[PDB]
Design a protein around this nucleic acid. Structure first.
Ligand SMILES: [Mg+2]
Ligand SMILES: [Mg+2]
Ligand SMILES: [Mg+2]
Ligand SMILES: [Mg+2]
Ligand SMILES: [Mg+2]
Ligand SMILES: [Mg+2]
Ligand SMILES: [Mg+2]
Ligand SMILES: [Mg+2]
Ligand SMILES: [Mg+2]
Ligand SMILES: [Mg+2]
Ligand SMILES: [Mg+2]
Ligand SMILES: [Mg+2]
Ligand SMILES: [Mg+2]
Ligand SMILES: [Mg+2]
Ligand SMILES: [Mg+2]
Ligand SMILES: [Mg+2]
Ligand SMILES: [Mg+2]
Ligand SMILES: [Mg+2]
Ligand SMILES: [Mg+2]
Ligand SMILES: [Mg+2]
Ligand SMILES: [Mg+2]
Ligand SMILES: [Mg+2]
Ligand SMILES: [Mg+2]
Ligand SMILES: [Mg+2]
Ligand SMILES: [Mg+2]
Ligand SMILES: [Mg+2]
Ligand SMILES: [Mg+2]
Ligand SMILES: [Mg+2]
Ligand SMILES: [Mg+2]
Ligand SMILES: [Mg+2]
Ligand SMILES: [Mg+2]
Ligand SMILES: [Mg+2]
Ligand SMILES: [Mg+2]
Ligand SMILES: [Mg+2]
Ligand SMILES: [Mg+2]
Ligand SMILES: [Zn+2]
Lengths: 50, 59, 114
RNA sequence: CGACUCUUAGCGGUGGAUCACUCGGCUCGUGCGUCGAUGAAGAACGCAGCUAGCUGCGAGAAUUAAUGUGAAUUGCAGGACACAUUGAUCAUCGACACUUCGAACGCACUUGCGGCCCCGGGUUCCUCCCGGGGCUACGCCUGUCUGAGCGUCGCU
RNA sequence: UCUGGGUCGGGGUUUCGUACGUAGCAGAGCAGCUCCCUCGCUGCGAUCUAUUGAAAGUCAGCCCUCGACACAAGGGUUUGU
RNA sequence: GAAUGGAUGAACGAGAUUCCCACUGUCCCUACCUACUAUCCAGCGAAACCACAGCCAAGGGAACGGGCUUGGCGGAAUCAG
RNA sequence: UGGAGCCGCCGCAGGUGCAGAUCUUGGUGGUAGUAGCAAAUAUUCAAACGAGAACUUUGAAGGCCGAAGUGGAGAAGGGUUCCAUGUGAACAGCAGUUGAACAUGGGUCAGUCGGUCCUGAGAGAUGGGCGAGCGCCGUUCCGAAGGGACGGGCGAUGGCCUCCGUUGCCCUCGGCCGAUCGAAAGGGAGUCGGGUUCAGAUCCCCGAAUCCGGAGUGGCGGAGAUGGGCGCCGCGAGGCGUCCAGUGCGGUAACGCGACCGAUCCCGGAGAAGCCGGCGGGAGCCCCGGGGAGAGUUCUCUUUUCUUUGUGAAGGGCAGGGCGCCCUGGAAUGGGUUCGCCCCGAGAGAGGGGCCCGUGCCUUGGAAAGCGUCGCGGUUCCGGCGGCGUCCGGUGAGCUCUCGCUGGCCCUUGAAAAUCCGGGGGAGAGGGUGUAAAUCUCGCGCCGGGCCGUACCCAUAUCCGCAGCAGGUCUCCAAGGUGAACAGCCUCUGGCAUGUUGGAACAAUGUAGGUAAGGGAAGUCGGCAAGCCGGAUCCGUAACUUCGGGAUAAGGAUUGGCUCUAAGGGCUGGGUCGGUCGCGGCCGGCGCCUAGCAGCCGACUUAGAACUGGUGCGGACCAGGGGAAUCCGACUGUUUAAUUAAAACA
RNA sequence: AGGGCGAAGCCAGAGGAAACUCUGGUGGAGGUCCGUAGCGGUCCUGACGUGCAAAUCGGUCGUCCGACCUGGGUAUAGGGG
């Protein structure tokens, strides 16, 4: 909005940190079932806890 | 710098002075959209920033 | 023609968001935001509709800054009340007290008579 | 013969049935039967050398101490350590620690405003200013102190 | 190779209605300058006359050229009593 | 049929009628033109619907058949409508 | 084929056998390479990159949005979409060398811009009451609802216990009014110019400011305030002794001057006010005439056409506005005067002043900075460095904003509070003749201002409508032409690539436009649809009527281009003759345009006339078809979001 | 936006013996008219109708100083608003 509270800004920050894709060294771990992050949120489609 | 989010400019100023034996003109904080309070810290004109920068490691 | 934008995040044209055009030394017309128009104080009498003389009509929280002389005038009831209403108050307050004395005299004569 | 269409079979696709597995469930039973103002449950935000999620933890943050164990952890790095030494790594968990909201407690929910005591810079108690610390919810009980009343008396 | 069809050009046909430019003693008036001459000279000025049935278009699905220019046995797939 | 209001009424109405003047392709009676489609192509590419299917006449039949009976008949694969 | 378990018999047990349930879950066809990728005028040429170009980028051309924008900025909402580099799998309904995709990194800086404080409609604890109860009501009502202050006293400590603080106690005084919450558009002190980034700037840098708080010991000046008397001594300037005065002064007045003590208490003001009209002043922009600097045009013409031609805040000065301020004075033959009014013995005109605003000029700022040009320095890096210039005037029912005055409307009268000041009072305090307490302090000096927001989009692609959806979604700015005009049409500034594709054809059906001989509603439920009409000026205007209307009634005429005419305004000027003093002044006498005349400027309209054209002329754009009657409802208003706008409701 | 109509009040002139009346101005009233933005939504029973759209589009329309339009805040909640 460009007029944020601090509460909201911090919320957004964490959401922004969560988006990154898996580190590829994770795929090489021993008992690995994970191939892709599957919790990736694109701003244009799917619109936050808000 | 990156600074702890709870800090006042007063605290930062006092920290910067304490750690690096330095002295500050002014501190000028903001908050990164990421979460880490950044701090621009103007040193007083008796001091050169590149000289301290070399002391602390960065360049 | 150079059109222009507001300089603050207040979009709406309001009592708060009033402006004026100014040419800078950079030779660009720029909005400057303008200070509200202060009023001279009206009289303590309350009948004289005209506002007071010799007072800097300025937004009241400024008065703080101003010198005493700007804020008033050298008279009894100075910068609170218009002259006319003082010199009527004066002679009223005098003439009233002269009649009160006359009634006191007529009372005292009536006591001495009875 | 030609193309096309139909039928059957071979092989290949599509699709994920079937079968075989099962660190999950469902049911029945046994023992114990423990949360919280010494701040619960729940929420938030953090924390990894490279880590997004799940988990694990709290600015001592994938954990500290202790005790037991006795050479690993390991995706890659890097390292440590003398594994003839409190000693890697797990387990236990009695010591320590435990950010912010939350019954949630100075008052407010902006993360905004405060008061009062002490400490360091600031002064040289000069109050300011900055930083730190400790108090500052409501209700209620036992006492304590200060009181109020043409409430009931006594003495003056 | 009835030497050919094509592009450009030229005629014809036809549509519209007389181009630009130049000239004019045409032009309601006005102005500047003077030789204040008012037909003085010079300029502005819709429009008008002449050059001028002019200009412009006319196969793209109009007609004739045999003028100019190139280009014209070339390619691919077929099929048998 | 009389404030279940009766009778009226200038102004007003995207309100309901009727006629006249004008005007018109509304019509007699249709025609031509333009643009975007539809069309063919490259690329891309859905859906509803679907017992099996899909030429008729008559008959009977749950009294209007694609299928049955008796007749007519029947020729790949398709395109635009 | 597969690669790890499985069956026969005798008994027992059951979630035990499918074609159907518009059955459930998953998958797959035909339909079909079909429908379809048609709203909003538009693309073309060359080059670059590149494996590859209809689509990227650059250049050139042709087009559109046409300042009520397809431009430039916000609010809400989004939440990293912003910027850069790289990728070409998927996604962006063709493609893509591209993107808001994907992957790497970057990126939001404040005492002054906002939150923050205030109160609004309202919300909501306590006390009190209700309530089986979680609770509810209630917000001044069934409250002992103030913890503060001043001055005095007494005690205690901390300090050069000096003097002052700090606290404890005692007295003294004190109405409130409800704790609290409630506005990124209300109220609310104080920041502006230039530069700077791939992306941030009133936030960074440079420079100029500014407010608020503190400032003790008071950092400094200045004010308070340094008179007057008497007595001596000294030639005199003066020196001493001693007596009083001194909480500033000026103006007839409006009121003024840099400061000019002062408590609880009281009064007042400011904050703090609707809409509409008219008129005036000030800016921004437009316009015109010229100066320059650079342009384009130049076949002919054009002293050309085009661009560009600056000064922040804060101070000081001065115009220019306004005054319902004062003094003089006394107005009928009544005057003054506005576009309109409106004012006058409760004081008009006339003269002189006082105050307020001064966003306008000048100046400090400030030319050093910016812009425009010409020119160099540097392979480079370089915010390099120089020249020149940044001028003078005029216009206005012009538009935008604004300040101001003055009306009109109301059975409408148009916010509170925080905060800030003024005045009345006079409890106190000050030192004793060089100083004091005092500065709603004057000028200077010192120190501080924390916390959170700050990227970008803001919409025919960052929001909501399942999507890059023809929908929806609050504002600011707002050029030239034509014209009544923010109408439409064309243009510059800025912006785009025709709205999720291209190519070739030009059949039928359509959708959207047009045109039609003769007739003119014969069509049809019905003139539905389209057509006529349309602007302006000049005439001319009926029935009826609530006398206001009807009314653009109806019905007529004119309209172009060109060349002329007439009519509408401002400014300035005579005090000439004589004298004398320095073309200018001062004095005295004539003159006295008192029918005014002379020179110099400048918008724009209106009427009339000539001539002229293939009768065309509101040439596009814009832009009423009328008439007679009936029914209903007086009217304006409202209504079924998405089939009913009416005669229904009001 | 821009136009139209031109209510009270005001001025002058003319008449009138008075009462007052006429003529020309000025003035700018109004849930006044036209008409933009805005708000709406009449008709084409137009387009669309597996849409652009789970109500949109085009022209044509109503209204456009007032019972006007509109952001944010705030109040009213289900036999309730
Ligand atoms: Mg969205
Ligand atoms: Mg405000
Ligand atoms: Mg004064
Ligand atoms: Mg097969
Ligand atoms: Mg499965
Ligand atoms: Mg009856
Ligand atoms: Mg009756
Ligand atoms: Mg009846
Ligand atoms: Mg059948
Ligand atoms: Mg196996
Ligand atoms: Mg079973
Ligand atoms: Mg089955
Ligand atoms: Mg097709
Ligand atoms: Mg932008
Ligand atoms: Mg980008
Ligand atoms: Mg694609
Ligand atoms: Mg508040
Ligand atoms: Mg006067
Ligand atoms: Mg921004
Ligand atoms: Mg925009
Ligand atoms: Mg198009
Ligand atoms: Mg295109
Ligand atoms: Mg689009
Ligand atoms: Mg016809
Ligand atoms: Mg018929
Ligand atoms: Mg008929
Ligand atoms: Mg019609
Ligand atoms: Mg009529
Ligand atoms: Mg009748
Ligand atoms: Mg009605
Ligand atoms: Mg409806
Ligand atoms: Mg309707
Ligand atoms: Mg329809
Ligand atoms: Mg259809
Ligand atoms: Mg489309
Ligand atoms: Zn008065």
């Amino acid at each position: 909005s460009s007029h944020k509270t601090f509460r909201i800004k911090r919320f957004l920050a964490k959401k922004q940190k969560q988006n990154r894709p898996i580190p590829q060294w994770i795929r090489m771990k021993t008992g690995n079932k994970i191939r892709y992050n599957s919790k990736r949120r694109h701003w244009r489609r799917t619109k936050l806890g808000l | 710098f990156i600074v702890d989010v709870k800090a006042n400019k007063h605290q930062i100023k006092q920290a910067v002075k304490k750690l690096y034996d330095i002295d500050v003109a002014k501190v000028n904080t903001l908050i990164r959209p990421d979460g880490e309070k950044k701090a621009y810290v103007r040193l007083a004109p008796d001091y050169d920033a590149l000289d301290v920068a070399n002391k602390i490691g960065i360049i | 023609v150079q059109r222009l934008t507001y300089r603050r995040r207040l979009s709406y044209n309001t009592a708060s968001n009033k402006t004026r055009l100014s040419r800078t030394p950079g030779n660009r017309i720029v909005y400057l935001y303008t200070k509200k128009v202060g009023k001279a104080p009206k009289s303590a009498c309350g009948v004289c509709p005209g506002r007071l003389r010799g007072v800097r009509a300025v937004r009241p929280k400024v008065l703080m800054r101003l010198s005493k002389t700007k804020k008033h005038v050298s008279r009894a009831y100075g910068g609170s009340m218009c002259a006319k209403c003082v010199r009527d108050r004066i002679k009223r307050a005098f003439l009233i007290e002269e009649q009160k004395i006359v009634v006191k005299v007529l009372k005292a004569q009536a006591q001495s008579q009875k």
